[PDB]
Amino acid sequence: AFAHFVLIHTICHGAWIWHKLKPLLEALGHKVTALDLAASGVDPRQIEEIGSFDEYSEPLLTFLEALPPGEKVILVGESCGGLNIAIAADKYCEKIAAAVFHNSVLPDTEHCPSYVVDKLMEVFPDWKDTTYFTYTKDGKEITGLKLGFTLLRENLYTLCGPEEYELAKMLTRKGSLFQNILAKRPFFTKEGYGSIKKIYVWTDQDEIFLPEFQLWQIENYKPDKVYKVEGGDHKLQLTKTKEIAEILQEVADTYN
Amino acid sequence: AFAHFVLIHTICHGAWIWHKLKPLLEALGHKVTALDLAASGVDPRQIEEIGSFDEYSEPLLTFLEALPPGEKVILVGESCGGLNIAIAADKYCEKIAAAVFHNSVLPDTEHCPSYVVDKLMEVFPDWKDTTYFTYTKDGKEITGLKLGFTLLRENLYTLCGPEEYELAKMLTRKGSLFQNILAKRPFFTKEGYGSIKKIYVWTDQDEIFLPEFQLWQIENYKPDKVYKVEGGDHKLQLTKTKEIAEILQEVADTYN
Ligand SMILES: N#C[C@@H](O)c1ccccc1
Numbered sequence: 001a002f003a004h005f006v007l008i009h010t011i012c013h014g015a016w017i018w019h020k021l022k023p024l025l026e027a028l029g030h031k032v033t034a035l036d037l038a039a040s041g042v043d044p045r046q047i048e049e050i051g052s053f054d055e056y057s058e059p060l061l062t063f064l065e066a067l068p069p070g071e072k073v074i075l076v077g078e079s080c081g082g083l084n085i086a087i088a089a090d091k092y093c094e095k096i097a098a099a100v101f102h103n104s105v106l107p108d109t110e111h112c113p114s115y116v117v118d119k120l121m122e123v124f125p126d127w128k129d130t131t132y133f134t135y136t137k138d139g140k141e142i143t144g145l146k147l148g149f150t151l152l153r154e155n156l157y158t159l160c161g162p163e164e165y166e167l168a169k170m171l172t173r174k175g176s177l178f179q180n181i182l183a184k185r186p187f188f189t190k191e192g193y194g195s196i197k198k199i200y201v202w203t204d205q206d207e208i209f210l211p212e213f214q215l216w217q218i219e220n221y222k223p224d225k226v227y228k229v230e231g232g233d234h235k236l237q238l239t240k241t242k243e244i245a246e247i248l249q250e251v252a253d254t255y256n
Numbered sequence: 257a258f259a260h261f262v263l264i265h266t267i268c269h270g271a272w273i274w275h276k277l278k279p280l281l282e283a284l285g286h287k288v289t290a291l292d293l294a295a296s297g298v299d300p301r302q303i304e305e306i307g308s309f310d311e312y313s314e315p316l317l318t319f320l321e322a323l324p325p326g327e328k329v330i331l332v333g334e335s336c337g338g339l340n341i342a343i344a345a346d347k348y349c350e351k352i353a354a355a356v357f358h359n360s361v362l363p364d365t366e367h368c369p370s371y372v373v374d375k376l377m378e379v380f381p382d383w384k385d386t387t388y389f390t391y392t393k394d395g396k397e398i399t400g401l402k403l404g405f406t407l408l409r410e411n412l413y414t415l416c417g418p419e420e421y422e423l424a425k426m427l428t429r430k431g432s433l434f435q436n437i438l439a440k441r442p443f444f445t446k447e448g449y450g451s452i453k454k455i456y457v458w459t460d461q462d463e464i465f466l467p468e469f470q471l472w473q474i475e476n477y478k479p480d481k482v483y484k485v486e487g488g489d490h491k492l493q494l495t496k497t498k499e500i501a502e503i504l505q506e507v508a509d510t511y512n
């Protein structure tokens with residue numbers, strides 16, 4: 001079967017991270033939309049204009065709003081993209097056939113929205129050469145960050161080719177986790193986000209979202225299905241593109 | 257010998273086009289700077305804020321200005337990048353060891369700055385699915401454009417892989433040739449631009465900068481050296497990356 005996959009990049013990244021996976025999925029006959037979230041990729045906004053993870057998710061929400069009645073999509077979010085998925089699911093649950101988490105945070109409905117992010121910071125406290133700054137938006141002090149090149153090389157793109165790592169150095173932009181804002185955000189709902197089918201994909205060779213963290217997330221909020229990809233790194237859509245496409249094809253044949 | 261190469265992308269593109277060449281040059285021991293020109297790549301400005309090819313060249317001029325006395329670089333410009341080279345050479349000729357044109361326009365000093373662009377439009381009049389728009393800046397009506405996906409696929413990235421073509425579809429932005437502005441711009445000078453060493457690199461398999469055009473440019477303004485790369489396409493830095501690196505190494509060993 002064919003599906004319409006909506007690929008969602010992580011913070012400081014853009015649609016470009018899916019440049020290998022998108023054409024492969026299309027070669028299987030699927031429709032693919034790879035969005036640039038607010039102040040990401042070639043989006044015209046700067047991060048200082050964004051005051052929350054919800055505002056950051058605008059392009060995704062706007063895209064879902066534009067889907068004609070009856071049309072459903074399969075969301076695929078990498079790393080922090082899981083938060084964009086939860087936000088989107090609480091507004092357009094009827095338009096989501098399923099959500100696929102790709103070495104991604106997996107928010108729940110029993111704890112605050114920042115819950116899994118707070119845990120991640122516990123498991124991976126040292127972001128190496130990553131730099132930080134602060135800006136104010138809507139009366140709140142937000143912590144912005146720019147991923148360090150060494151962190152990118154060693155922990156995020158560990159096994160990626162030099163040409164892929166180069167794209168990261170050239171294209172990654174300042175962003176934010178909006179952690180303190182998430183902490184005060186209303187909880188994700190059981191009727192919306194809680195109701196969607198969730199497929200969790202990961203590799204135990206991820207050098208930033210370590211096994212302890214990912215296995216902790218799986219136990220905390222049981223996915224409907226779990227796929228473990230052998231080898232690769234945090235950016236499975238670059239290092240295990242074929243494997244990810246095969247998994248997504250099965251998801252398309254399972255949920256509609 | 258080692259050199260400091262400054263890679264200059266063409267209109268509607270960004271530093272990302274050099275994502276394969278940059279690490280290869282560094283593997284040879286060179287220093288490489290791949291800039292995003294105004295309103296290009298991840299530069300924060302939008303094209304409507306830019307009123308001339310000179311303003312568009314700001315990042316390059318600012319970079320050259322920051323070079324300490326005595327430090328020289330080898331400029332490498334692709335496609336329309338040759339115009340940025342000419343503009344830069346008339347301001348920082350002493351900081352340029354040589355300029356390498358990569359399937360690039362080759363401005364001269366005997367004719368108006370728009371001369372070779374006007375000729376290009378004669379040789380390649382149909383830009384297929386490319387779209388156009390107009391905006392006003394500093395009292396002048398500027399024609400903006402967004403490269404069509406079919407033009408990108410068939411004429412610019414003819415032999416590039418699907419993952420490279422995907423990057424182009426995701427990252428190319430609105431831009432402009434500022435043709436009418438170039439037509440009224442003071443001529444490039446003989447003392448500045450005219451004095452720098454010029455190396456012309458091209459392939460007769462280029463599907464947009466056709467042989468008739470490139471051979472016409474070579475006869476119009478004789479380069480100090482001409483390198484013809486066999487095969488490949490308009491984006492030699494993607495399809496013949498190794499060959500381009502070998503040529504640049506020879507240039508580094510020849511001009512300083
Ligand atoms: N890749 C990616 C980003 O989501 C990221 C960057 C740094 C730490 C955790 C996550």
Ligand SMILES: N#C[C@@H](O)c1ccccc1
Nearest residue numbers: 266267335336403412464
């Ligand atoms: N590649 C590239 C651009 O410079 C370009 C795009 C369309 C026509 C001519 C040149």
